[PDB]
Amino acid sequence: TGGMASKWDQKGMDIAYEEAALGYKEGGVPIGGCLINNKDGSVLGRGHNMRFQKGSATLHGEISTLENCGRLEGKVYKDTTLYTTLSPCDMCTGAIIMYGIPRCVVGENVNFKSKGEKYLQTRGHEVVVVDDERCKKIMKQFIDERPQDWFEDIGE
């Protein structure tokens, strides 16, 4: 990219936001994601945080997105972008790193940012922060109303 946005990035972030809004409406943490094949723009999967929905300690948005893509040949991930409405925690960062997903496009990092955002860069990934106000507003709403649930979701 050279820092150029991808032709698929608007689509990816819109899907991630749709997933965040759906999870909000389900009574969960409003964090959504999607994984797009950069070669053809195909959406390999989409998901949102399922902590409340499933009683899940590991289904963050990014993890649920990856789960929803199913088992894949490792090479597939090497030319994908993971879209996440919120800057990834250390766990989801680790997932991106493990699979070698080269680009992580982040809705916002104002309500939350871990050391993972920079660690992705150290590990050779491209991180794009869009500063999407849709994402920021829904996440801020959740934190305002359910702070202890939010803290649980990031292990505090």
Added chain:
Amino acid sequence: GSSMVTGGMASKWDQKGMDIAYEEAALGYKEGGVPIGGCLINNKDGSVLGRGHNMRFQKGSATLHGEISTLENCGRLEGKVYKDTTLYTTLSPCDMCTGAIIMYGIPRCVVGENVNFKSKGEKYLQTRGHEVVVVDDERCKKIMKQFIDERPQDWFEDIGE
């Protein structure tokens, strides 16, 4: 990582923790899965918060590595509950599982072996302030070597290659 890293001390619960992790790995192996198991133990009293094994083949899962399945099986917990625990894993954690340990602040990780696999995560745990102990458990090494030998492409899939 740092030149000044050092392996952590043993805990009175390590035999218990690695034996549970290994039993989980062997159960997963019998189920047709990747033989990697784990458990999470409270360092103060030895209680087992949860245990699990890799569920990639059992569940068609791209995220349920042994360590992730272990954490899932522990359920939702207050953040504080993790902060004096050990995660036992039969295999040195990949970057994903490392990240889970870091995110929850699980301060100690005991690793069955890192001969068959080792990621940057083992050292990154230490960089980030976590204790790591590698016990070089022969049972763990044997079962993982067998899996990699017999099903190499399935193993590569499990580590994203």
